[PDB]
Design a binder for this molecule. Structure first.
Ligand SMILES: Cc1cc(OCCCc2c(C(=O)O)sc3ccccc23)cc(C)c1Cl
Length: 150
């Protein structure tokens, strides 16, 4: 996974954390950090409407999952894979995956389970990169993500 994986995890966990708490890391990267910031800016921008517009499907999804603990979060992978894989793959679908992650993360802070946010982000990244690796590489990874939403 390397650089695409490292970059994806950094963006998605920071995004899920900011959405739940606070917030800001104000922390280094400091890697391919120009790309990461821009992607974090666009995701913050694009993620905006998406959460609101799907407040209904999201709420429906959330009740249906009944997430209460760390063991619950660790079993979401295949349901994630089931809703996300088969179809058109495009950046809107990817932002919906991550936006729902943020939605779940906020719920996690609500039931006082902020500690599950990080394994949640890790799980989402693992699903994003394993099911969409070749599409992602083809789109210039996160650099391309910004252009589609400029
Ligand atoms: C079960 C789950 C699914 C996730 O995203 C699936 C892909 C995005 C998506 C859809 C899609 O790809 O069209 S429809 C839909 C409805 C509710 C929530 C998300 C969603 C994302 C997470 C974090 C979890 Cl836990």
């Amino acid at each position: 996974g390397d650089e695409l994986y490292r970059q994806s995890l950094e963006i998605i966990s920071r995004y899920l954390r900011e959405q739940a708490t606070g917030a800001k890391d104000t922390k280094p990267m400091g890697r391919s950090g120009a790309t990461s910031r821009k992607a974090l800016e666009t995701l913050r921008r694009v993620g905006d409407g998406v959460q609101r517009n799907h407040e209904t499907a999201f709420q429906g999804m959330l009740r249906k999952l009944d997430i209460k603990n760390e063991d619950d979060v660790k079993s979401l992978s295949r349901v994630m894979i089931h809703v996300f894989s088969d179809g058109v793959t495009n950046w809107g679908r990817i932002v919906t995956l991550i936006s729902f992650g943020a939605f779940v993360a906020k719920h996690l802070k609500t039931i006082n389970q902020e500690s599950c946010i990080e394994p949640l982000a890790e799980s989402i990244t693992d699903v994003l990169v394993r099911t969409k690796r070749d599409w992602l590489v083809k789109q210039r990874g996160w650099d391309g993500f910004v252009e589609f939403f400029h």
